[PDB]
């Protein structure tokens, strides 16, 4: 489907990457969702058990969805759009080195991008958008959504 | 799908309306389901956590399913038929004043109607059916399903 | 889903009611779609053979979708929202007397409403909207969608 | 889904086995559908081009649906239940020798069984039912569904 | 769908048959899943609450999926392929007498067969395969998957 | 789903870009499918009317699937993976200048990539693969899939 037909969406962290502290991961992911709930009527809640709408997973190589990871570098992550099962799920390539900042690959920034896909956003052709296909680091304190990003997400969920 | 392909169906009360006591809501909803399980092989169970087949929700205005509520009066509630995700979900317009009896809008009676939709029943053209499109109050102690209602639900689930 | 994920939609008149001339049925249905395409980016095309997104059917009593018609009066027609299979399909009760005027049930006016459902619109609580649940004849020459009708349909397909 | 949500169903013979004359294949398949339409409100129509609800195909070995045929003998055919895509589709193993008599494998008798699956019927444990899992030839002139066959099919489509 | 698009699959025992000790049932089922995870990248986890991918159920007669059981003998069990809802679910006919060994019907062996279906395997025509349609008892200590079984499951999930 | 569950797939060119001759568009699209059928058990057929598995469309700006094109440059095209409805559909941005050579954007080369998506292939991180995300012109006479392209496509359809 093009969008989640509800405002209360849940997510769950399937497993944790040993690259970061469990709570730094929770923080990065939660702040990532917060980026999108700030400009839409959507609200996100983390759950530890049961099925959630969006399952955040860390994995390497082939992990069952037929879109295997490629080791360090190259593809860093991917996610599926709204739907049942794997729909909305965001997978992070464990072969990358996830960090809270500019060392290795920043989890927060990458998560903001993937959640974009999870909510129904495709790639943007605007270099300022978080949905632009190329990864780059910017400080979390000064990071913000481009206008193209706001338009896209609001086109889908309004507010 | 036209029907739930199982006899054990679960439901969960997403949130409670502040118009009634939490337990009066539980009672109204549970008795509503009981009305249908009495004439079919179906059985309903309430769960507090995890995804349930039927999510009972209280909400106002636009709540994400693209069928926004209209404030007090007019549409009182709605529900989707059997299926994944929002399928089977029953939404109650919080702008209405829900009551245990004839004050405002009776939750039990409305719930019986919506659960009818949740189980796959459309609107009936018979004025005596609970599936008739027009809301009316009747005492819970003397309320009963019309023959048209029994035929419809049994046509779907038998017994 | 909540909407057809395309602007070019096809429909097919499965069979014709013997109440009107084939040419009149086609005209009425064509005009009904036109009402909605005039306020959205949508474009409609009629096909004579093969699968269409929207199948217009005339039937009576139980016709397979578990929402049996009730003979003369009452249920005049019904339609399923966007989706595969019967999704988007519009069924007209052949037990009604379809006409091009104010006598019997007006095909054109009923079609505009049904197509509203086929496009993803639910019932409106505004008495002036074509999506209001109650059928009524109105000058078929000065007929126009109500604001609520325009808002809702453009909320889905924009323009 | 458990059943086709309509009474008018279409089928298409994708390709013909070189074992029989085109006319004989058509006759056998037509007679097979007739068996079921005679005991239900269902009506079947063959189309020569385009998508049908039920696609009849002759294939051998691995043919794309992950349920590869086994060459001569063993699996004679299989079909998917009601649904979109390959749902309802019936596949006949071209490695079998299809005939109009008791030699080789009888097309007509195998078709009645396969169509049972296409309509939503699973295997029966009654030795006298066409849905019993074991293929056997029987006088194709006095052939008739068993009671279990009638009950099950009318349990889905009634009449 | 043809396969579960993930390597971590969960299952849950809906209810227990009174024929065996609760833990003997857990053991039989768990060992059954182990048989398949041994030759694939798949991994299975039991959960007590929430929805699981594969729901193991004990039931008699008609239980809602339109594939009613037939009492003692005949059909012993069945399961649906990968998918949402009932997809992947394995149902065991309670009218059979389930045992840890050769008395009555062996639960472990039957479970290995049904889970095969749950993972997307159809019936095999090879008499040595666990996916062969006919039930037979062999000691759990010397039971092993046929080559045909290994090929099928690995064709779907690799490794 | 991850893949088309059949070896015979149909496609239809919904409309033609005015940039090239109808004959050239057909040739380019035909050659694009040929690239993939040459390395898999798949067979492709073009149909002029009716529903195809893969619908090739030329469009500009917002065209209904919520993934609007961006005018000249940037997004050249996109396609949906295997599935019903728009599943498998390939959209080409009419704002691009489609050609049979190295000027403008080469239709054939872009089609091979898009069809990769339509068949279930995601983007590759190998610079030599047609599925790499970056469009580039290459001698359309010595063009050949990269090993990564062959592995991935045969991983889904084999051969
Ligand atoms: O490293 C790369 O950029 C290429 C690689 N990319 C990825 O896998 C991915 C790149 C991103 C991504 C993350 C953050 C931002 C972003 C935007 C704006 N402000 C801050 C952050 C943009 C994209 C997610 S996966 C890739 C290679 C090959 C094929 C597909 C993708
Ligand atoms: O108030 C109304 O009746 C109109 C309004 N209705 C609703 O929203 C609704 C009305 C009902 C309903 C509730 C109970 C009963 C019933 C039947 C038999 N015995 C006891 C109770 C019937 C319908 C649910 S939502 C409405 C307005 C505009 C468009 C659609 C619906
Ligand atoms: O006399 C009878 O037996 C019943 C007759 N049915 C009817 O007249 C019916 C009247 C209605 C009805 C529909 C909508 C609303 C409504 C009003 C305001 N806001 C929202 C919704 C009220 C009534 C449904 S059937 C009938 C007869 C024969 C066959 C079918 C129906
Ligand atoms: O209205 C009835 O007679 C009851 C019956 N209704 C229907 O089947 C239907 C009523 C309509 C309908 C058609 C046109 C208009 C309309 C609005 C504004 N201007 C012009 C035309 C409104 C509704 C379509 S089906 C019904 C019965 C039971 C449950 C729901 C609806
Ligand atoms: O000799 C061989 O290798 C095996 C041969 N396969 C067979 O004969 C086969 C026999 C059966 C079989 C099917 C159903 C039942 C049955 C009986 C009673 N109640 C329910 C179900 C028993 C057996 C399947 S394949 C075969 C050979 C070549 C190709 C395919 C199959
Ligand atoms: O029967 C076989 O040779 C085994 C094979 N079976 C099949 O493929 C099939 C057997 C049948 C079948 C056809 C007709 C009748 C029938 C019933 C009553 N009166 C007349 C006709 C029963 C079954 C269709 S496919 C098979 C192999 C492996 C797994 C399941 C089934
Ligand atoms: O009792 C029978 O075999 C027929 C009956 N079968 C079933 O319901 C079923 C039979 C089985 C089955 C269980 C274990 C094994 C097996 C294979 C290899 N090694 C050890 C164990 C094979 C099949 C599951 S349900 C049946 C009757 C009628 C219609 C369909 C099926
Ligand atoms: O100048 C502009 O405004 C932006 C222009 N857009 C672009 O040039 C764009 C460049 C890219 C891009 C795509 C993939 C990769 C990449 C590289 C390596 N590994 C993986 C992925 C890098 C960039 C997307 S749009 C544009 C203009 C007008 C309309 C659309 C796009
Ligand atoms: O490449 C661009 O100009 C950016 C844009 N890309 C596209 O739309 C697209 C790029 C391609 C593509 C076509 C052919 C080849 C290829 C590979 C090897 N040998 C020959 C040909 C690679 C990619 C299809 S759409 C884009 C923008 C924003 C987000 C994703 C992609
Ligand atoms: Ca990587
Ligand atoms: Ca790592
Ligand atoms: Ca209201
Ligand atoms: Ca209230
Ligand atoms: Ca009527
Ligand atoms: Ca009539
Ligand atoms: Ca065979
Ligand atoms: Ca043959
Ligand atoms: Ca039994
Ligand atoms: Ca028992
Ligand atoms: Ca463009
Ligand atoms: Ca152009
Ligand atoms: Zn993944
Ligand atoms: Zn991305
Ligand atoms: Zn709602
Ligand atoms: Zn209602
Ligand atoms: Zn209908
Ligand atoms: Zn209506
Ligand atoms: Zn097949
Ligand atoms: Zn069969
Ligand atoms: Zn069952
Ligand atoms: Zn089996
Ligand atoms: Zn598009
Ligand atoms: Zn691409």
PDB file of N, CA, C and O and ligand atoms in Angstrom, chain E residues 69-77 93 95-96, ligand 18:
ATOM      1  N   UNK E  69     -12.415 -31.045   9.610  1.00  0.00           N
ATOM      2  CA  UNK E  69     -11.802 -32.342   9.856  1.00  0.00           C
ATOM      3  C   UNK E  69     -12.887 -33.409   9.801  1.00  0.00           C
ATOM      4  O   UNK E  69     -14.076 -33.109   9.919  1.00  0.00           O
ATOM      5  N   UNK E  70     -12.462 -34.653   9.633  1.00  0.00           N
ATOM      6  CA  UNK E  70     -13.374 -35.771   9.447  1.00  0.00           C
ATOM      7  C   UNK E  70     -13.481 -36.796  10.572  1.00  0.00           C
ATOM      8  O   UNK E  70     -13.916 -37.925  10.334  1.00  0.00           O
ATOM      9  N   UNK E  71     -13.102 -36.424  11.787  1.00  0.00           N
ATOM     10  CA  UNK E  71     -13.179 -37.380  12.873  1.00  0.00           C
ATOM     11  C   UNK E  71     -11.964 -38.284  12.822  1.00  0.00           C
ATOM     12  O   UNK E  71     -11.045 -38.034  12.043  1.00  0.00           O
ATOM     13  N   UNK E  72     -11.953 -39.336  13.640  1.00  0.00           N
ATOM     14  CA  UNK E  72     -10.820 -40.257  13.684  1.00  0.00           C
ATOM     15  C   UNK E  72     -10.528 -40.890  12.330  1.00  0.00           C
ATOM     16  O   UNK E  72     -11.443 -41.309  11.618  1.00  0.00           O
ATOM     17  N   UNK E  73      -9.246 -40.961  11.982  1.00  0.00           N
ATOM     18  CA  UNK E  73      -8.862 -41.533  10.706  1.00  0.00           C
ATOM     19  C   UNK E  73      -8.986 -40.518   9.582  1.00  0.00           C
ATOM     20  O   UNK E  73      -9.265 -39.335   9.819  1.00  0.00           O
ATOM     21  N   UNK E  74      -8.780 -40.978   8.351  1.00  0.00           N
ATOM     22  CA  UNK E  74      -8.867 -40.091   7.209  1.00  0.00           C
ATOM     23  C   UNK E  74      -7.827 -38.998   7.337  1.00  0.00           C
ATOM     24  O   UNK E  74      -6.668 -39.275   7.647  1.00  0.00           O
ATOM     25  N   UNK E  75      -8.237 -37.755   7.113  1.00  0.00           N
ATOM     26  CA  UNK E  75      -7.313 -36.636   7.215  1.00  0.00           C
ATOM     27  C   UNK E  75      -6.849 -36.485   8.660  1.00  0.00           C
ATOM     28  O   UNK E  75      -7.662 -36.414   9.581  1.00  0.00           O
ATOM     29  N   UNK E  76      -5.536 -36.447   8.852  1.00  0.00           N
ATOM     30  CA  UNK E  76      -4.950 -36.325  10.186  1.00  0.00           C
ATOM     31  C   UNK E  76      -4.616 -34.877  10.537  1.00  0.00           C
ATOM     32  O   UNK E  76      -4.660 -34.497  11.707  1.00  0.00           O
ATOM     33  N   UNK E  77      -4.274 -34.087   9.518  1.00  0.00           N
ATOM     34  CA  UNK E  77      -3.912 -32.684   9.696  1.00  0.00           C
ATOM     35  C   UNK E  77      -3.721 -31.964   8.355  1.00  0.00           C
ATOM     36  O   UNK E  77      -3.813 -32.571   7.291  1.00  0.00           O
ATOM     37  N   UNK E  93      -5.909 -32.563  13.653  1.00  0.00           N
ATOM     38  CA  UNK E  93      -7.220 -33.113  13.964  1.00  0.00           C
ATOM     39  C   UNK E  93      -7.190 -33.766  15.346  1.00  0.00           C
ATOM     40  O   UNK E  93      -6.562 -34.804  15.541  1.00  0.00           O
ATOM     41  N   UNK E  95      -9.388 -35.406  16.805  1.00  0.00           N
ATOM     42  CA  UNK E  95     -10.034 -36.713  16.852  1.00  0.00           C
ATOM     43  C   UNK E  95      -9.029 -37.854  16.693  1.00  0.00           C
ATOM     44  O   UNK E  95      -9.349 -39.011  16.952  1.00  0.00           O
ATOM     45  N   UNK E  96      -7.817 -37.534  16.255  1.00  0.00           N
ATOM     46  CA  UNK E  96      -6.785 -38.551  16.132  1.00  0.00           C
ATOM     47  C   UNK E  96      -6.223 -38.669  17.539  1.00  0.00           C
ATOM     48  O   UNK E  96      -6.448 -37.782  18.376  1.00  0.00           O
TER      49      UNK E  96
HETATM   50 CA1  LIG G  18      -9.271 -37.270  10.819  1.00  0.00          CA
END
